[PDB]
Amino acid sequence: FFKTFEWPSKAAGLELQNEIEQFYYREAQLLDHRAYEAWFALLDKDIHYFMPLRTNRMIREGELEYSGDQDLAHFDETHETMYGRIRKVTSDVGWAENPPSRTRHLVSNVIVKETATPDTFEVNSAFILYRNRLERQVDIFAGERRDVLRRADNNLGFSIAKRTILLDASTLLSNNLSMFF
Amino acid sequence: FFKTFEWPSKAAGLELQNEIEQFYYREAQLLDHRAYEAWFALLDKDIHYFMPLRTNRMIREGELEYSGDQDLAHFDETHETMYGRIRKVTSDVGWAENPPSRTRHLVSNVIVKETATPDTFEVNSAFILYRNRLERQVDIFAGERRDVLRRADNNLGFSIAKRTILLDASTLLSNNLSMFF
Amino acid sequence: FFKTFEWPSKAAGLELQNEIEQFYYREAQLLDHRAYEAWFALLDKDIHYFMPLRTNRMIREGELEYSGDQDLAHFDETHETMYGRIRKVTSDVGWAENPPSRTRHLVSNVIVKETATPDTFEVNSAFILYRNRLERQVDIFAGERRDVLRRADNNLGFSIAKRTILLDASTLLSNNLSMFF
Amino acid sequence: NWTPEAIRGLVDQEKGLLDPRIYADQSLYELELERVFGRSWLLLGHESHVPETGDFLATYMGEDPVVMVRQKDKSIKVFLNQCRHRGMRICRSDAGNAKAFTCSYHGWAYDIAGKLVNVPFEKEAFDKAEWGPLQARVATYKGLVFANWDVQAPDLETYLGDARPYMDVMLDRTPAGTVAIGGMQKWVIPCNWKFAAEQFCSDMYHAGTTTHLSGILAGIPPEMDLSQAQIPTKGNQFRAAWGGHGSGWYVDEPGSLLAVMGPKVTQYWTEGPAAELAEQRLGHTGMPVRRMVGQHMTIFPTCSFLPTFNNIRIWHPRGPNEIEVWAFTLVDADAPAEIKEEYRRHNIRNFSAGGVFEQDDGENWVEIQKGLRGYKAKSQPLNAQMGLGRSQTGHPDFPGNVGYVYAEEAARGMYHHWMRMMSEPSWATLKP
Amino acid sequence: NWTPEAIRGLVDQEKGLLDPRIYADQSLYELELERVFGRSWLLLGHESHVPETGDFLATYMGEDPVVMVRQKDKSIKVFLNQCRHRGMRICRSDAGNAKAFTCSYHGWAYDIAGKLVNVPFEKEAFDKAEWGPLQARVATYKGLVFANWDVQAPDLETYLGDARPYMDVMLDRTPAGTVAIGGMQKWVIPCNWKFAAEQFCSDMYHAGTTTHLSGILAGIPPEMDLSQAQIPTKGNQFRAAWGGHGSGWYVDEPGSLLAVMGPKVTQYWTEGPAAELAEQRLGHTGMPVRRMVGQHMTIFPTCSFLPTFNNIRIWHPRGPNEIEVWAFTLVDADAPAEIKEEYRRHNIRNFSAGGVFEQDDGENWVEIQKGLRGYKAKSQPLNAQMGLGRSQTGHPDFPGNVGYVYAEEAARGMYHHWMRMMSEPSWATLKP
Amino acid sequence: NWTPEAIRGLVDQEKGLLDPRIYADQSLYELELERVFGRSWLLLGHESHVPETGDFLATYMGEDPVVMVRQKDKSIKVFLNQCRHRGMRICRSDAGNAKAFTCSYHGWAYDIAGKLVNVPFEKEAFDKAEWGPLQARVATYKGLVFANWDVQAPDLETYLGDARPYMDVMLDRTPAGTVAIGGMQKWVIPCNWKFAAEQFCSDMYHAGTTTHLSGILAGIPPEMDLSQAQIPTKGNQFRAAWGGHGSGWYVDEPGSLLAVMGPKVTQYWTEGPAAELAEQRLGHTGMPVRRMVGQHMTIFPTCSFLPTFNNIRIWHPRGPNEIEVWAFTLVDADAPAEIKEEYRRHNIRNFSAGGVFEQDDGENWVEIQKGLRGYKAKSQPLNAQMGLGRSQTGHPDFPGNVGYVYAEEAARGMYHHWMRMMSEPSWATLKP
Ligand SMILES: c1ccc(-c2ccccc2)cc1
Ligand SMILES: c1ccc(-c2ccccc2)cc1
Ligand SMILES: c1ccc(-c2ccccc2)cc1
Ligand code: FES
Ligand code: FES
Ligand code: FES
Ligand SMILES: [Fe+2]
Ligand SMILES: [Fe+2]
Ligand SMILES: [Fe+2]
């Protein structure tokens, strides 16, 4: 259902390119240093935070690789349910992240596209999420993020309106997804 | 012998830097979404697609690390040979990639150098190729790429005249190389 | 005692951003191609090359995550002791790197902050260091670097006055730290 | 090789003691694949996972890959996903529609029934009817598809026994029956299957104490915290007469359902036409199903579900130190769109790998298994004494052997049956 | 432990049956290291890999690291890459030239023959000539360097037997001999060695059916598709009289060679001075070599090659579930530079880790091994019945026990000899 | 199974032979957790890791997770970091302060003493004083904390015996004793624990020869090269009368201390008021402490330190093929601020995972362990004949069985005691 990101033939301006990249780099810093309240503040009221299931299909049935909007997902969240996730992760009795993990969000491959709304941008990016916890536990994630970002008066310059995380996995190799993407 | 990339003392302009960066980000998108016919179009008729063997040598015998142009290699390709590889990867009976794998080409460290021919460029970039397939198979590759890129009237803006992939591996830890670098 | 990096509200100019990025890409190239005397030349006489220990702590004792300046560390180096390490790694009788490893320093997330001193910048960046040695040994590290860089009249345009490496690990999963970060 | 006498001493239901070696020993695990998984009824999915002809779903029976595929006569067949020539996987995708199955190694062709129909160059080089992949016994229980290799084993209904009323709380609410919401979520946990099987069999204790405090908090209104949250204490627990099955539920604690599933599902389950139709359809059991909330269940060995939440999962064993979790969600076929979406959203929110409840289970199990690497950690019996001797068969509301919600009678039974299956070679003695 | 009676039960060449456990059992594997790899002739490479005095190559015999080094007296010595003081690896690089070998742990110095020539502080703190790394027997066959630990084992010539002629098709084409093209590629495949060793011994079937359809497609003309490509059916297969060796080839179907190797390699092999000289030099065997195309061969246990393609591979076992594939390419020493290049080019394209043929082999072998984790998957024997009792010794064109190209006679020999080596403890009975 | 007779033949201290299988064998390793680690005194750290009440350190005894915790009465307690209910880890952080310990699974609460003081719903659903985690015996030695499971095992002092005077070189120099510098480094080496323990027991040889050539080079001024580095030859080695403990040191070779610890520490060790107070306190042993440099020591089985450098580490076994290195640094409590800093800096530079000396040890051990996967690599004995019968118990300067610094008498004693512990089930024979 997803296929190649429809990049604009005319590439985004250097100033805009730099701003979006810098937004992600700041966001990664917020996540890796567990500033969850500050990261959640970036989420707009109408946020759709979504991570579909990915399956092994024969090329002939390739249209069925990703789960749909009425199927199960790894994440299918709104502002209200995300708040609860932030509530849990910051909680002393939240055993999955207390002691907390050690994450690295290495962001690259940023492609910026204009939408039909001015100052709203559709951004395609790639990441490797390295998660280390307890003594020896290491979980490496890779995939892409398809975002809808809005210009905003905040510390980072943008707010998140939509996030679809396309993970390079069928079966998850991690015991949980106690980290934010 | 390969050694440190001979970067120009005067670094490329912000515009060109951005053009080459965006080219790879789109290229990675093509490969990670299995648009093989579209990616094959990027390769010029005189393409040399090369990935030499890497061996364990004492500092003294360092000049012998990589294999030569008359030795075996992981890849040593022309346009004709790449064609057959693209013919196989898109096939219903190409079992190694049917079901297809789930890859992420994370490109960074792009160093641009202007060459002899105007509008032809010598590019150095580092990468990590995360490859996940079937149920639980995960193959991670890391290395650098040495490209000759010509300006082209395609959707990406450039074509690939020559590519050398320097892989950080002696023995290959993956069962095959069904992916493209 | 580290917390979220204090990026400036006004993002550094595009010229300076590209200068710092190309510096790290060049520095990576020297390290990945084992140009150690060339890499050591970047280190100022007053360099502090630091990698603290990281521990598992409950949220309530989060202030104790990193080791102090009077505690043990993975690296706590001066310009003199750093050269000793350069003597060791270039040595024919330095077994840990003879045969040498095959490393990849993939750099991104570069955040530049200007300081009270012009031409001196506090820099944040994230990396994934992929290390492959001997037949099958693979060591993957992830983290961030907190540098204080100075404008220099060398081949790379900058010199390193300070470097703190925050590694995403508690117990180190590699048998040694023979590589440079 | 373990002796029957040595196996019997690994579990003691009288004293309430468990040998920690059962979760870690390699040769006990190699036995489990033969003695337990080789002859047990195992959940593979739901009828609606394979609705049309040729529709298949690749899954597991223990560590044996199997294909579940719908036949033209509407029956469901299950066969080993292994070619009998040189062992290659016949069905190489997760799910889909097939008109045939072909081996990619030497091109042995199969129909959708798993019968070998063509061998290339057969005339130049044996009967094809004898060399198809091993066939499993298939049975359906009210939507759910089960499988068993052993022809000498008791059939599904008999195997299930008096555990059936508690399955029906989830499975038999409407005349239309249940449908599986699309999507099969899969993740890996480094723990023994028995910890996970037991928790859903018997362990309401973990949810009513410390494990899920942050999970509850996640549903709790922003202006409220845990000090104001009701702690459910009223409920019961069921031990199957035979089979090591178990279930547990809260009684008259609708706030505990509200805290997990939200208001719309709480309404759907407790009040209205649908809730009343469900209790009248289970009248034969005599159970007040409108008052039954937060329920957990395991059909031994590895079939686990959460009836009130519509969450279902299979635990695929992967050695003594690992499992895979394969989870999906059900809804009544004729449930309003609004309710189906609420069940879908809340199941993702709570019971996926990223779920606000799930996260803390995997976290607990990972540490337990790590601890069992040690010698002294395996030297002393673990306590399984909760609710010892407090269960009785004559409960006015709930049939079978029933005790208090916070007990380990259902657990002791699971482990006693595990022990039995492991120590008793023949069904002649092992069957109900 | 495995009794000789139980070992014989694992293979039945009369019925053509194989026990799947042979590819999975850890205790059988440990026995393989002693009873097979401990006393078999194992390929280390080519004489051209070590042409000059001091030139070495670090390789393996089973899971034992060995050093192959050329001596001043023009001979080759093979010794365990292990210092007898505290086990440190003596030679720590892939290949090169050495004047002496020195241990990096305590400094025990060795000459290029493997003799302990210096011990630091020896006088201050035992006979040096007694404490050198275990030496192996070295025997060469027309360029190829083999090694064996067992002094009771038969010499290389006797070991090979009537398999020699089929090795000559590749090795004995010119009085100039063969030379190894620079570079040895190495990759890891999670499967048992016997799958890989059998495929090259007996399995043209996989290449003749489905495994390589995309490989053919990759080498076939761009204007042509699969349904136009002709399927080769004519050819023969050979079973060695002793040793579990085996070979297979197509006869009068050069279109199979064209697709894989290109027109120039096809011409050099089938037409001209070189092709007729190769048929003259192998005249003593009476084999029409120019008609023989797409050949495969195994010298038991882990020496495999494709004669017509000049591709050679050693399988290093890494447990029952893993191997390492170390591959290199041969050329005729006096072949045209364009022929040397065509052999180099098409070997990379077809038979490397990313090769259009090799890709699919690994893919198959991986899924077979994963399937054998299951209990039922190891519970029923595998079919090795192709060409049963259809081979004979009186063939007009090819010497030895010869059958149809698509057969499993060579495979049965390989497994029967594997069985013989595993059961019989002494060369007294085991030898030919 | 490993019979006592078979276990006894693994080590031959008479001929100086070691069976390489002791480093590799799985079933032998499992015997070690019981026979060795389950009844030996094992180092957990320093009293200054847990200064005040409620202070804890999460550490290990073998593969058993333990909690070291300071009590109200100033004593130290050690209990198994495992809940006796269902096995969950009670203490989930590396270090810190605790008012109590609560299980996150079912909420069983423990006081700082490891006593079970609260069970949720205990009245509703057995004695708590009978179900707390397993307690280990705690004994301290001049700051160092040791633990032991076995109640029949000899007390620390007797266990140590005549090795104590060599520990006092590092531990008993000041009346105020030693303190641990903050922070504990942890890393993973894929090698057997006996390689690491033996090296610090007996192996100056490796440092005096090839291993640390680049380590000396790193601590040498840029203008100076290895040709100007003086090889140390003067020194002695000690083997404990009982225990498997051992030590080695240089005599009058202050170049070795300087090249590692620098001038400021070399002065602190040899000259000044503090160096004088040390030799006065250590006078009763009769040892010239101010003349001893580059000292290594192992207290069997896994407590190793470098007294001259104040480098201490614990080897945690993780199977026959893996260890964890847990290392810290000591200083005198009253030592000047400049001196502590110098110990800190040089320990990091030399003996952390990135250390210029430590890096090379890791490389050696890893390549030995990899080699021992080979069959023939385990088939022959390893040489342990250094100083065979050259040591005597009547040295004028150093007490106990003392020989040359370059010897393996301490090594032979370490393995002989290892042998003894593995083959003798009762302390009746094993005790000193
Ligand atoms: C086993 C698994 C989950 C639960 C459970 C979790 C949350 C809310 C209610 C019950 C109980 C037993
Ligand atoms: C084993 C390996 C490869 C082949 C083969 C491949 C291509 C063409 C002809 C034979 C046969 C057996
Ligand atoms: C064991 C461990 C370390 C050393 C050592 C290394 C360098 C300098 C002095 C002693 C000797 C034996
Ligand atoms: S393996 Fe299935 S056809 Fe040969
Ligand atoms: S191991 Fe070779 S010298 Fe000690
Ligand atoms: S595991 Fe500690 S209370 Fe259940
Ligand atoms: Fe739970
Ligand atoms: Fe093949
Ligand atoms: Fe050392």
> Which of the listed residues D136, D160, D184 is the one where a domain comes to its end?
D160
Backbone angles phi, psi at F200, to 5 degrees: -80, -15
**Is the C-beta atom of F181 inside 6 A of ligand 3?**
no
Query: If you count residue pairs, one on A and one on B, with CB atoms under 8 Å apart, how many are there?
Result: 92
Half-sphere exposure (CA, 13 Å, Cβ side) for E377? 28
CA of E308 to the centre of ligand 3 (A): 57
Q: DSSP letter at F26?
A: H
**Same domain assignment for residues D206 and D135:** no
Q: Nearest bound ligand to CA D131? A: 4
| Partners of residue D66 on adjacent β-strands | D59, D80
**Same domain assignment for residues E127 and E171:** no
- Inter-chain residue contact D107 with E210, CB threshold 8 Å: yes
Tokens standing for A151? 């210009």
* Dihedral angle computed from the Cα positions of residues B88, B93, B99 and B105, in that order, rounded to the nearest 10 degrees: 0
Closest CA relative to residue D309, chosen from D365, D353, D250:
D250
Q: How far is CA C53 from CA C77, C166, F327, in A?
A: 14, 9, 12
Beta carbons of E185 and B74 less than 8 angstroms apart? yes
Closest CA relative to residue B107, chosen from C150, F244, F205, A109:
A109
Cβ of residue F100 closer than 8 Å to a chain C Cβ: no
Strand order across the D95-97 sheet: D42-46, D144-148, D135-141, D76-80, D64-70, D55-61, D95-97
Q: List the single best residue of F32, F80, F86, F101 to mutate versus D (max D Cβ within 10 A).
A: F86
User: Which chains does A contact via 3+ CB–CB distances below 8 A?
Assistant: B, C, D, F
Beta carbons of C39 and C47 less than 8 angstroms apart? no
Helix (H, G, I), strand (E, B) or coil at B14: helix
d(C-alpha D279, C-alpha D285), whole Å: 9
Residue E337: which residues within 8 A CB-CB, separation 6 or more? none
**What is the number of residues in chain A?**
181
Backbone angles phi, psi at D413, to 5 degrees: -65, -40
Which stretches within chain C are classed as H helix?
14-32, 36-40, 79-89
Q: Is E191 annotated as a binding residue?
A: no
d(C-alpha E262, C-alpha E273), whole Å: 19
Tokens standing for A43? 């989420």
**Is the C-beta atom of F313 inside 6 A of ligand 3?**
no
Helix (H, G, I), strand (E, B) or coil at F48: coil
Helix (H, G, I), strand (E, B) or coil at A143: strand
**Same domain assignment for residues D240 and D146:** no
d(C-alpha F407, C-alpha F388), whole Å: 8
**Same domain assignment for residues F69 and F22:** no
**Same domain assignment for residues F32 and F100:** no
Half-sphere exposure (CA, 13 Å, Cβ side) for A66? 15
| Partners of residue F315 on adjacent β-strands | F325
D49 by Cβ neighbours in 10 Å (0-12 / 13-18 / 19+) ranks as buried
Cβ of residue B156 closer than 8 Å to a chain C Cβ: no
Strand order across the D303-306 sheet: D178-189, D323-332, D311-317, D303-306, D292-299, D246-251, D235-239, D401-404
Apex E103 CA angle, E102 and E106, nearest 5: 120
Q: DSSP letter at E355?
A: -
d(C-alpha E300, C-alpha E310), whole Å: 18
**Same domain assignment for residues E215 and E304:** yes
**Same domain assignment for residues D234 and D339:** yes
> Which of the listed residues D160, D183, D208 is the one where a domain comes to its end?
D160
d(C-alpha F194, C-alpha F313), whole Å: 14
Beta strand C49-52 with C158-167 is: parallel
d(C-alpha F136, C-alpha E340), whole Å: 71
Annotated binding residues of F for [2Fe-2S] cluster, written as ranges, equal 83, 85, 103, 106
Angle between helices F358-371 and F193-202 (to 10 degrees): 130
Strand order across the E17-18 sheet: E11-12, E17-18, E382-383
Q: DSSP letter at C181?
A: -
Please tell me whether the peptide bond between A99 and the residue prior to it is cis, using omega within 30 degrees of 0.
yes
Please identify among residues 224-253 of chain F the ones whose CB lies closer than 8 Å to any CB of chain C: 226
- Inter-chain residue contact D125 with E390, CB threshold 8 Å: yes
Q: Is D201 annotated as a binding residue?
A: no
- Inter-chain residue contact B136 with D93, CB threshold 8 Å: no
Tokens standing for E375? 């209990």
Measured by CA distance, the residue closest to atom 3 of ligand 6 is F106
d(C-alpha D51, C-alpha E96), whole Å: 64
Backbone angles phi, psi at F239, to 5 degrees: -115, 125
What is the resolution of the experimental data for this entry, in Å? 2.4
Beta strand F101-102 with F95-97 is: unpaired
Measured by CA distance, the residue closest to atom 2 of ligand 1 is D200
d(C-alpha F3, C-alpha E421), whole Å: 29
| Partners of residue D77 on adjacent β-strands | D69
From the CA of A94, how many Å to the nearest CA of chain D?
5
Which stretches within chain B are classed as H helix?
14-32, 36-40, 79-89
Q: Pick from C18, C30, C99: which is nearest to B17 by CB?
A: C18
Residue F355: which residues within 8 A CB-CB, separation 6 or more? F348, F349
Q: DSSP letter at E47?
A: G
Number of Cβ within 10 Å of residue F59's Cβ equals 24
d(C-alpha B176, C-alpha E355), whole Å: 8
Which stretches within E124-223 are classed as H helix?
156-160, 164-171, 193-202, 205-208, 213-219
Q: What is the DSSP string of F348-412?
A: HHHHSTT-TTHHHHHHHHHHHHHHTTSSGGGSSPEE--TTTT--BS--SSS-SEEEESB-SHHHH
d(C-alpha E394, C-alpha B41), whole Å: 56
- Inter-chain residue contact E210 with D106, CB threshold 8 Å: yes
CA of E208 to the centre of ligand 8 (A): 9
- Inter-chain residue contact F106 with D379, CB threshold 8 Å: no
- Inter-chain residue contact B95 with D93, CB threshold 8 Å: no
**Same domain assignment for residues F12 and F55:** no
Single-letter residue type at D118 = N
Half-sphere exposure (CA, 13 Å, Cβ side) for E102? 14
Sign of the C-alpha dihedral, residues B132, B137, B142, B146?
A: negative
Tokens standing for D332? 């009544």
Domain that holds residue F117: 40-160
**Same domain assignment for residues E379 and E337:** yes
CA of F108 to the centre of ligand 6 (A): 6
**Same domain assignment for residues E124 and E227:** no
Q: What is the DSSP string of F54-118?
A: TEEEEEEETTEEEEEEE-TTS-EEEEESS-TTT---S--SSEEE-S-EE-TTT--EE-TT--EEE
Q: DSSP letter at E154?
A: P
The region that residue C3 occupies, defined by phi over 0 for left and psi between -120 and 50 for alpha, beta otherwise, is left
Beta carbons of A122 and A111 less than 8 angstroms apart? no
CA of E95 to the centre of ligand 9 (A): 28
Sign of the C-alpha dihedral, residues E158, E162, E164, E167?
A: negative
b/e code C50-84 from CB counts within 10 Å (16+ = b): bbbbbbbbebebeebbbbeeebbbbbbbbeebbbb
| Partners of residue B124 on adjacent β-strands | B111, B146
At the top level of CATH, the class of C1-181 is alpha beta
b/e code D101-124 from CB counts within 10 Å (16+ = b): bbbbbbbbbbbbbbbbeebbbeee
Tokens standing for B81? 């040979």
F29 by Cβ neighbours in 10 Å (0-12 / 13-18 / 19+) ranks as buried
**What is the number of residues in chain F?**
432
Helix (H, G, I), strand (E, B) or coil at F156: helix
d(C-alpha D294, C-alpha D308), whole Å: 6
**Same domain assignment for residues E166 and E300:** yes
Closest CA relative to residue F254, chosen from F243, F245, F262:
F262
d(C-alpha C132, C-alpha B168), whole Å: 6
d(C-alpha D266, C-alpha D281), whole Å: 19
Cβ of residue B72 closer than 8 Å to a chain C Cβ: no
Beta carbons of C68 and C95 less than 8 angstroms apart? no
- Inter-chain residue contact B168 with C130, CB threshold 8 Å: yes
Single-letter residue type at F28 = L
Number of domain units in chain D = 2
Cα-Cα end-to-end distance for chain B: 20
d(C-alpha E340, C-alpha A33), whole Å: 58
Q: How far is CA E19 from CA E6, E13, E377, F27, F284, in A?
A: 11, 11, 10, 27, 72
> Ligand 6: which atom is nearest the Cα of residue F88?
1
For residue F88, the chain D residue with the least C-alpha distance is D368
Beta carbons of E114 and E79 less than 8 angstroms apart? yes
**Same domain assignment for residues F281 and F380:** yes
Beta strands in chain A, from DSSP E residues, in sequence order: 43-52, 73-77, 102-114, 120-133, 137-151, 158-167
> Which of the listed residues F134, F160, F186 is the one where a domain comes to its end?
F160
Name the one residue in this structure whose structure tokens are 């593995």: F422
